[PDB]
Scaffold this motif. Structure first.
Motif, short mmCIF file in Angstrom:
data_model
loop_
_atom_site.label_atom_id
_atom_site.label_comp_id
_atom_site.label_asym_id
_atom_site.label_seq_id
_atom_site.Cartn_x
_atom_site.Cartn_y
_atom_site.Cartn_z
N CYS A 35 7.04 15.97 14.88
CA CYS A 35 5.84 15.50 13.97
C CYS A 35 5.18 14.33 14.22
O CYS A 35 5.88 13.19 14.61
N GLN A 36 3.97 14.41 14.14
CA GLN A 36 3.05 12.94 14.73
C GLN A 36 2.76 12.42 13.29
O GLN A 36 2.20 12.74 12.31
N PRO A 37 2.95 10.85 13.37
CA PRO A 37 2.32 10.12 12.34
C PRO A 37 0.94 10.29 11.87
O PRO A 37 0.24 10.14 12.87
N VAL A 38 0.45 10.42 10.60
CA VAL A 38 -0.60 10.56 10.53
C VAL A 38 -1.42 9.24 9.78
O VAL A 38 -2.63 9.12 10.07
N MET A 39 -0.78 8.39 9.13
CA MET A 39 -1.21 7.03 8.72
C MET A 39 -1.07 5.98 9.46
O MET A 39 0.03 5.66 10.18
N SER A 40 -2.24 5.08 9.64
CA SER A 40 -2.08 3.76 10.46
C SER A 40 -2.55 2.94 9.10
O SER A 40 -3.83 2.83 8.78
N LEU A 41 -1.81 1.71 8.80
CA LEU A 41 -2.25 0.77 8.03
C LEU A 41 -2.87 -0.33 8.96
O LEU A 41 -2.10 -0.99 9.50
N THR A 42 -4.28 -0.51 8.70
CA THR A 42 -4.73 -1.62 9.63
C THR A 42 -5.66 -2.72 8.91
O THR A 42 -5.97 -2.42 7.97
N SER A 43 -5.91 -3.57 9.49
CA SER A 43 -6.82 -4.69 9.03
C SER A 43 -7.19 -5.67 10.26
O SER A 43 -7.44 -5.11 11.34
N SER A 44 -7.59 -6.87 9.84
CA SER A 44 -8.04 -7.82 10.84
C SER A 44 -7.79 -9.13 10.85
O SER A 44 -7.24 -9.49 9.56
N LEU A 45 -7.78 -10.02 11.68
CA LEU A 45 -7.36 -11.43 11.70
C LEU A 45 -8.65 -12.12 11.13
O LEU A 45 -9.73 -11.76 11.18
N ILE A 46 -8.37 -13.00 9.88
CA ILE A 46 -9.41 -13.59 9.37
C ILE A 46 -9.47 -15.31 9.68
O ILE A 46 -10.47 -16.11 9.21
N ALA A 47 -8.31 -15.79 10.44
CA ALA A 47 -7.94 -17.03 10.97
C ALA A 47 -6.94 -17.18 12.10
O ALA A 47 -5.99 -16.43 12.01
N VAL A 48 -7.19 -18.11 12.99
CA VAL A 48 -6.17 -18.22 13.93
C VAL A 48 -6.32 -19.92 13.96
O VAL A 48 -7.33 -20.54 14.40
N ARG A 49 -5.31 -20.55 13.27
CA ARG A 49 -5.10 -21.91 13.07
C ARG A 49 -3.86 -22.69 14.20
O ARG A 49 -2.83 -21.98 14.33
#
Ligand SMILES: *Cc1c(COP(=O)(O)O)cnc(C)c1O
Ligand SMILES: *Cc1c(COP(=O)(O)O)cnc(C)c1O
Lengths: 359, 359
Positions: free
Chosen positions: B231-245
């Motif tokens: 069975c193949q995974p259906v969901m991917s919880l994604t986002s983005s970086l808003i800072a690199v410090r």
């Protein structure tokens, strides 16, 4: 019948904003309404507080959603903007923003706006999450006062990492750093959220940012409730029983056979689970009110249901009112019992939960 | 969007329904889509599976929401109806229902409906959650075959409490009880959900009810994934970086100063927190993919942000893609690292997470 529902007391919401003005009498109020007003609902919570000096949100999406609902008051982007192409909207919508990086700064420097934008330079004073570090702040700050696109003066914002731990010198150190950088600078200053407001009167300054306590919940990790500060609980997580069944001694309940009864009893089944936002981690024994009487959760919390021990001749019946937390049962009491933060309990709820507003 | 987003693979969804038909070749399929289809989206998940024999939901409201979106297959009310005044809608909407109590049965006995309703008598075979107990089941069953409001024959449904624990005899005991009651009876039989389908082929019977495994996630608590069953995974919880410090040795990160760095390094800040549904229990070290490369979470997970350790010299920057779980990173790995059930991880997400559908 009624199932998973969050009842929001608008009256208690109002009381808390006013109560916080009494506790921070020389500071304006930034009602923090991020994450759907902390599970209470982002637009309804804003409409309940037309007295708020401003509203704080995590993301630009949330601010725009406020403007879409007719909220007109200044909205503070606590994390700033994530794309330079957003400045024109921010400017036109009259959104105030935090500026913590060079992307954001360099963008404001070369953007072409029809109006300048009100800004709060985020300073990292110890949290090490967002913000310009002390040794880069003076130069960064000076570039903002030279922006024709930034309304002057540049305001200064920061946030506490351990204000709920008065015994460690974390807060006094952040305050020391905050104070050193603000010396001689005009512009509003703001560093206090719920904890700083209640425990540190030296950190009130010009603007305070009440979040959790605005909803009548204590930000502290001790047994304290919003009522310890004169704040009234706004949310009530409610539902109803969908079954009252006979059960016998030695018989287990729920997935994994987590709980086994030592007596013949009657079990109640609640139309509430983690598919609604109720913690799956809730251990047997966690309190829940059935017909205004406290009964314990028995067995693992499922996606849509929760079982409780009512008693052998308990006269509770499918359809009867259940309170997961609210009047009679503070969310702080559920946090202590389940070991889940009250912040997460009230906020990590799903769209399956209905919303009610009273008063 | 570039922040909190759930990407749903419609092609993995279809693959899983047919892969499950291969594992349970003599049984019809009840696609379980309760709790917003386990966080994937109630109406979109149904529209992606027009091949499903039926759809299962926890509550009446969910079924009605399916009819509202145009979904026409049969919908099974897994917990039945909570109010007798609902029978008219249920009959007219062609909803099939479970019947576990007397209130429901008595309702069917005296209702006046334009059409009879298809029913599944819920039998308690060991879970002790919902259902008629063995010693009351024969009389209860007989009353249902005498209803002219019930479409004959009366079908029989039940659910496993510990199918993911093959070494305890609980399942064979429920099966023993289920089989004894069904002897000589004319309707459809159903007791298997994800676990029963994968580990117990003798529980497939007429209808199986795939839930979690339909979304390509393993039901079991060992470390296996949906791919262990094709069975193949259906969901991917994604986002983005808003800072690199920049960050230095000896400096803590986040609330409570939970994590302290032993080098100088660079920290990334993700637009993801528990206000989105990400577990605030996630310990430092939990894996996250940044630019398709695994980095650890450092410090407490906040309501809207998560910090990760990128390295001293690392070239990631604000705006770059982040995967909380998905292509490079099964939700089962995050469940192990987090000690949070995969069921709750994918389901207890908030309405602030955006929804994307691909393929
Ligand atoms: C969310 C947040 C707040 C509110 O904090 P509480 O402890 O809930 O009052 C205030 N300021 C900032 C920067 C925040 O991100
Ligand atoms: C939700 C549920 C299911 C599906 O369960 P999974 O473990 O995700 O396979 C099937 N049947 C009933 C009775 C349920 O309540």
């Amino acid at each position: 019948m009624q199932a998973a529902t969050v009842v929001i007391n608008r009256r208690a919401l109002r009381h808390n904003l006013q109560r916080l003005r009494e506790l921070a009498p020389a500071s304006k109020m930034v009602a923090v309404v991020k994450a759907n007003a902390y599970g209470h609902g982002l637009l309804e919570t804003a409409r309940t507080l037309p007295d708020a000096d401003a509203f704080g949100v995590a993301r630009l999406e949330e601010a725009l959603r406020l403007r879409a609902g007719g909220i007109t008051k200044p909205v503070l982007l606590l994390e700033g903007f994530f794309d330079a192409r957003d400045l024109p909207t921010i400017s036109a919508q009259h959104f105030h923003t935090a500026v913590h990086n060079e992307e954001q700064l360099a963008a404001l420097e070369e953007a072409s706006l029809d109006e300048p934008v009100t800004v709060w330079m985020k300073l990292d004073t110890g949290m090490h999450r967002l913000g310009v570090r002390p040794e880069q702040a003076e130069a960064f700050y000076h570039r903002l006062t030279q922006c024709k696109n930034v309304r002057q003066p540049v305001n200064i914002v920061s946030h506490f990492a351990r204000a709920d731990e008065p015994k460690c010198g974390a807060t006094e150190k952040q305050l020391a750093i905050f104070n050193t950088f603000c010396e001689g600078k005009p512009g509003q200053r703001s560093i206090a959220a719920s904890g700083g407001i209640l425990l540190w009167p030296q950190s009130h300054f010009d603007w305070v940012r009440p979040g959790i306590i605005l909803y009548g919940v204590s930000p502290l990790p001790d047994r304290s409730t919003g009522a310890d500060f004169g704040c009234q609980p706004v949310m009530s997580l409610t539902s109803s029983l969908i079954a009252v069944r006979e059960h016998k001694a030695g018989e287990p309940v729920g997935y994994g056979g987590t709980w086994v009864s030592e007596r013949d009893t009657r079990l109640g089944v609640v139309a509430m689970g983690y598919g609604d936002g109720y913690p799956r981690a809730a251990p047997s024994g966690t309190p829940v009110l059935v017909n205004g009487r406290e009964v314990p959760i028995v067995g693992r919390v499922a996606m849509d249901m929760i079982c409780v021990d009512l008693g052998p001749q308990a006269q509770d019946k499918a359809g009867d009112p259940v309170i997961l937390w609210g009047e009679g049962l503070p969310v702080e009491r559920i946090a202590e019992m389940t070991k889940v933060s009250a912040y997460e309990l009230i906020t990590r709820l799903t769209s399956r939960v209905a919303m009610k507003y009273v008063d």
